[PDB]
């Protein structure tokens, strides 16, 4: 899942952040429309 | 400065956080206190 909805965000938040921490970016959709991006920080 | 929320808060307050991002805000995400990710809006 490279694009997840709001429901999946809550149910999967820990795992989604693990993936971003491993370098993935993940698109967040809201009623099917892409609205936000989760990207890794340089840290 | 910015808003920083942890994963717990992201889950618990998801609707309020996405409302802010859709209004244009970028938010820092922490994982057990360490900054790990950026939640930023896509332009519409």
Curated annotation (Swiss-Prot), chain A:
Transmembrane segments: none
Function: Antitoxin component of a type II toxin-antitoxin (TA) system. Neutralizes the effect of cognate toxin VapC46.
Stated family: Belongs to the phD/YefM antitoxin family.
The protein's name in its UniProt record: Antitoxin VapB46
Source organism of this protein record: Mycobacterium tuberculosis (strain CDC 1551 / Oshkosh)
UniProtKB/Swiss-Prot annotation, chain B:
SS bonds (residue pairs): none
Recorded superkingdom: Bacteria
Signal peptide bounds: none
Entry function: Antitoxin component of a type II toxin-antitoxin (TA) system. Neutralizes the effect of cognate toxin VapC46.
Record-stated family: Belongs to the phD/YefM antitoxin family.
Protein's name in the database: Antitoxin VapB46
Organism: Mycobacterium tuberculosis (strain CDC 1551 / Oshkosh)
